[PDB]
Design a protein around this nucleic acid. Structure first.
Ligand SMILES: Nc1ncnc2c1ncn2[C@@H]1O[C@H](COP(=O)(O)OP(=O)(O)OP(=O)(O)O)[C@@H](O)[C@H]1O
Length: 529
RNA sequence: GGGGUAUCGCCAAGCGGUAAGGCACCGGAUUCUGAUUCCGGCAUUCCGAGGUUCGAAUCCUCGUACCCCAGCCA
């Protein structure tokens, strides 16, 4: 429960409503991100919890920032998260003729006029945060004059910026938004839904309350930066002939540590080619997180955990990562892969090899087992061998023995270094009566596989509050390795988490993998204590 | 000027009856993954100072900090 659900509860009890109807209304000017997932979880979650309805409405009022690519991706992401909207997909543009009729009602009532103060002047006349504004000299035109001028705007008789329609409210209001807000502005831009039918487009505040009202939304849930705007939400609905009056309730937006959510900013990273694209695995976008190997359920859980309050907040990446590790630990089948490999030859070995039976899940016998090959010339991870180290080090030191994963207890004996002091191969012996643990991959049957180790995109926790967020990009956000994996990984499918033992959870990258050369993105590392 | 918020390192519950829970962190047991699982510890204190009350995080003052609003963006 959260403050919003307590309100809905009151509403139902008091008999103010019988059904609850919410809506998720993104503008199609970019791809959805983890922050939006919190609105999706909130809006669609309430609908299903209260057996209500939730609309997916594209708030498409500004054509010069929107594109059809975004509408199809947004729908994709909403479904992938595991949610379904009520009825057909809606668009604010579906209501352009409606919105235009309402503007006329406002004009007819003398509550709206066509102003001609230039874009620079409207700012000058608006006042400041402590000084009231002043009336445009075009404020007292007659209704008859406004109808004429407005139809002229509609007919394309005015150049962009040359005229706009404003609400006649109060230039001295302490609410900056009630200072004669613009309802319509001229944009000769083709719209992704309505083509060139319109050259005048409605503003967010005029469009939002009216759309909610027409869809019979009972509770509009938005983020905190809209509390000031609520005054205009109610003023519009109170002054036009509409039979219902939805109520707006604001919650705090999600800020994630080490990442920027601003679409304006996320678009800079994509536009300037600093990430592969909106769905690059380092992006905090839904599609990015999906490609990274995140599961829709891990995200739904993440929203469940962070809560819904009116408090500004900043969640640590640790919280997100906790969610995904938990999901994958449960459902991810284990496998073996070596990221940085140094060759290890067992001298004592006899034969072209053998076959060990490894479990697909160490703590869940039910998941099955597999027959993995073994031999003398295997592949091991560099960081697992040490010529010398204290008692703490529980891996392969040049003296003692260590158990291979589901195999033999080998024993370090001799090292053969390259010219530059760097080791090239390690020589050891094994006890055959056996079958300090490490993973390995029989060089004989090793599958060459490219690994992509992702790390946080920014090097500061709040790249948002930086003079230039780009200059604070982490150069080690993506470190590409070439390694080897057991041949079973030959049958992996894009977006199927595997837990490379003692490393982390990894998944096949659809964008880069091929037949011989698979590419694995590292979703998340293990709790490396 | 106006509109909001203040409870653990990060989130968060609490609604006059004596500070849940999660992440992180520290131990300790188990483990052929330095994972997982288990065990236990982690707010005498709720922005501060006064006051009301048998009892206040919660009520009433009076301060303080932070966030939002001056797009013909959403
Ligand atoms: N960080 C966030 N946390 C929570 N909810 C968010 C967040 N960002 C956006 N939303 C929610 O998603 C809804 C749709 O957002 P929309 O795409 O219209 O704008 P935006 O993404 O906030 O802005 P921009 O496109 O400039 O980044 C908003 O109604 C809002 O409540």
């Amino acid at each position: 429960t959260n403050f919003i659900r307590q309100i809905i509860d009151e509403d139902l009890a008091s008999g103010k409503h019988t059904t609850v109807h919410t809506r998720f209304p993104p503008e199609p000017n970019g791809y959805l991100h983890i922050g939006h997932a919190k609105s999706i979880c909130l809006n669609f979650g309430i609908a299903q919890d209260y057996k209500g309805q939730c609309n997916l409405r594209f708030d498409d009022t500004n054509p010069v920032k929107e594109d059809i690519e975004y509408v199809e991706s947004i729908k994709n992401d909403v479904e992938w998260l595991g949610f379904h909207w009520s009825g057909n997909v809606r668009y604010s543009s579906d209501y352009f003729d409606q919105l235009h009729a309402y503007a006329i009602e406002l004009i007819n009532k003398g509550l709206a006029y066509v102003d001609e103060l230039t874009p620079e002047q409207i700012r000058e006349y608006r006042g400041t945060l402590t000084q009231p504004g002043k009336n445009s000299p075009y404020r007292d035109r007659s209704v008859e004059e406004n109808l004429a001028l407005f139809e002229k705007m509609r007919a394309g008789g005015f150049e962009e910026g040359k005229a706009c329609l404003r609400a006649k409210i109060d230039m001295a209001s302490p609410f900056i938004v009630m200072r004669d807000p613009v309802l319509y502005r001229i944009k000769f831009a083709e719209h992704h839904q309505t083509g060139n039918k319109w050259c005048i487009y409605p503003m967010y505040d005029f469009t939002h309350c009216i759309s909610d009202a027409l869809e019979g939304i009972t509770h509009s849930l938005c983020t905190l930066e809209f509390q000031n705007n609520r005054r205009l939400y109610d003023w519009v609905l109170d002054n036009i002939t509409i039979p219902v009056h939805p109520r707006q309730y604001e919650f705090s937006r999600l800020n994630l540590e080490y990442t920027v959510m601003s679409k304006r900013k996320l678009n800079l990273l994509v536009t300037d080619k600093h990430v592969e694209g909106w769905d690059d695995p380092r992006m905090p976008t839904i599609s990015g997180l999906r490609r990274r190997g995140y599961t829709a359920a891990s995200i739904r859980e993440f929203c469940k955990r962070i809560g819904v309050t009116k408090q500004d907040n900043t969640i640590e990446m640790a919280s997100l990562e906790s969610c995904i590790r938990e999901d994958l630990n449960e459902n991810a089948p284990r496998a073996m892969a070596v990221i940085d490999p140094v060759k290890l030859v067992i001298e004592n070995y006899q034969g072209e090899g053998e076959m060990v039976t490894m479990p697909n899940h160490p703590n869940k016998p039910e998941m099955g087992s597999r027959q993995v090959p073994f031999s003398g010339e295997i592949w091991i991870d560099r960081a697992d061998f040490r010529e010398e180290a204290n008692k703490q080090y529980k891996r392969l030191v040049l003296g003692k023995e260590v158990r291979l994963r589901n195999a033999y207890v080998i024993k370090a004996e001799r090292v053969e270094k390259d010219a530059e002091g760097n080791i090239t191969t390690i020589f050891c012996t094994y006890d055959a009566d056996t079958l300090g643990v490490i993973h390995w991959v029989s060089a004989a049957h090793a599958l060459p596989v490219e690994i992509r180790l992702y790390d946080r995109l920014f090097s500061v926790p709040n790249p948002g509050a930086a003079d230039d967020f780009l200059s604070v990009i982490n150069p080690e956000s993506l470190v590409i390795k070439q390694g080897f994996a057991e041949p079973s990984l030959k049958d992996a499918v894009a977006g199927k988490a595997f837990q490379f033992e003692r490393e982390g959870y990894f998944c096949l990258d659809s964008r880069h993998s091929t037949a011989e050369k698979p590419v694995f993105n590292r979703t998340v590392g293990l709790r490396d204590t």
